[PDB]
Amino acid sequence: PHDNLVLIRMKPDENGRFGFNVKGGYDQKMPVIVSRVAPGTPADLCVPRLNEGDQVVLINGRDIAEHTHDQVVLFIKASCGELMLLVRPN
């Protein structure tokens, strides 16, 4: 992914949550995909909105192509004061 990308910025909630699920990485033979988006959460109310099926390319400006699922999760957990995501819509 490099042609039609979307840059998303979201501030975490009171509990330090964004309201979205991730699947894949380097340890999993599948890219990082946003599997689920919870309603009324930062991921659901941000502009542009983070949608289900979006392929994650960057997390806070870092390339996560060679990173495992656990590392990807911990990188998102280190942006809590906003989370930056570069995704490919699907």
């Binding site: 949550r17 964004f18 309201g19 979205f20 699920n21 991730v22 699947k23 990485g25 340890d27 999993q28 599948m30 599997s35 689920r36 919870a38 699922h69 999760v73 998102i76 957990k77």
Partner: peptide, 6 residues
């Protein structure tokens, strides 16, 4: 297939 909420 691992899934994690954030």
């Amino acid at each position: 297939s691992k899934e994690t909420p954030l």
